[PDB]
Amino acid sequence: MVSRIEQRLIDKGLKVTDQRRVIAQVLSDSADHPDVEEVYRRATAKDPRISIATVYRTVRLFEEESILERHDFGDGRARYEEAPSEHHDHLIDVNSARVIEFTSPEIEALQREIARKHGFRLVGHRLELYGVPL
Amino acid sequence: MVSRIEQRLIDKGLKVTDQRRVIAQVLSDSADHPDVEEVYRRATAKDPRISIATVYRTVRLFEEESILERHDFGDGRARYEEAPSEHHDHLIDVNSARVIEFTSPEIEALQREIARKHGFRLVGHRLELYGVPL
Ligand SMILES: [Mn+2]
Ligand SMILES: [Mn+2]
Ligand SMILES: [Mn+2]
Ligand SMILES: [Mn+2]
């Protein structure tokens, strides 16, 4: 098969050039929330004709198309992942910038109830935990 | 006879100029997490000699001195409040930008367990809820 991101591109009728295929594959493979520079090093290592400008343009395309989600965990560094098929939040090692995903149905339910008590429906939220190793 | 923020400047040995006093008063009085433009409008209504540049510099001074906390609820728009005595999180109306503060000891406990289970101690977190009125 083609990468998950390539398939999403086909679904939306966007052109799949050689270089876009490489970038889509890099991003589908990655689960570590790479920044644009990291996507670039991975992509250009596969196809050396890929420039950082093309990676910027391609990541913007994916973000515009809701294929990628972007995070800034505090340090102003944009980090990217596929639109997850399951909601999760993030715990970040403040020393190494390692990101861990977690889900807490209990917190999700508590958030929605807090919104309800205040007369609101929740349309979005951001939960980030900042940690140092025990 | 002084605002809470002016008291903090007194505790730090910092000169309270007339313009610092007005800006401190505006911020101590504000409960709506104002941006800098809004602080400016309120300060300049009290004393029309105060320029927008002075407001920006003074808010920056207060933030650097840990007298104010700065929030960016996702849009890049900096909003301010006195450094809170008690921890709270925020629910934001995505239509009006109105901010509601809340606490949830149950959520706070769950966050601690989540960090622990992944081998971390929590040094900080960010929880923002985005709502629309029911
Ligand atoms: Mn969540
Ligand atoms: Mn993620
Ligand atoms: Mn909290
Ligand atoms: Mn607050």
Residue numbers in the entry:
A (entry chain B), B (entry chain A): 1 to 134
Paper's wording?
In most bacteria, iron homeostasis is regulated primarily by the ferric uptake regulator (Fur). Fur, which was first discovered in Escherichia coli, is a global transcriptional regulator that directly controls the transcription of over 90 genes involved in iron uptake, storage and metabolism. Several holo-Fur structures have been solved, revealing a modular domain organization including an N-terminal DNA-binding domain (DBD) and a C-terminal dimerization domain (DD). In this study, we present six crystal structures of apo-Fur, holo-Fur, Fur in complex with the Fe2+ transport protein (feoAB1) operator and the P. aeruginosa (or E. coli) Fur box.
We produced a C9L/M14L/M16V-triple mutant that successfully generated diffraction-quality holo-Fur crystals. The overall structure of holo-Fur was a homodimer with the same secondary structure as that of apo-Fur. The two monomers in holo-Fur had nearly identical conformations (r.m.s.d.=0.36 Å) that differed substantially from those in apo-Fur. The large difference between the apo- and holo-Fur structures arose from the conformations of the two N-terminal DBDs and two hinges. Thus, the binding of two Mn2+ ions stabilized the hinge conformation and induced profound conformational changes of the DBD. Each holo-Fur monomer contains two Mn2+-binding sites (site 1 and site 2). Site 1 links the DBD and DD. This site contains a manganese ion, Mn1, that is hexacoordinated by two residues (H33 and E81) from the DBD and three residues (H88, H90 and E101) from the DD. Site 2 resides almost entirely in the DD, within the β3 and β5 strands and α5 helix. In site 2, the manganese ion, Mn2, is also hexacoordinated by residues H87, D89, E108, H125 and Q111, while a water molecule mediates interactions with the latter.
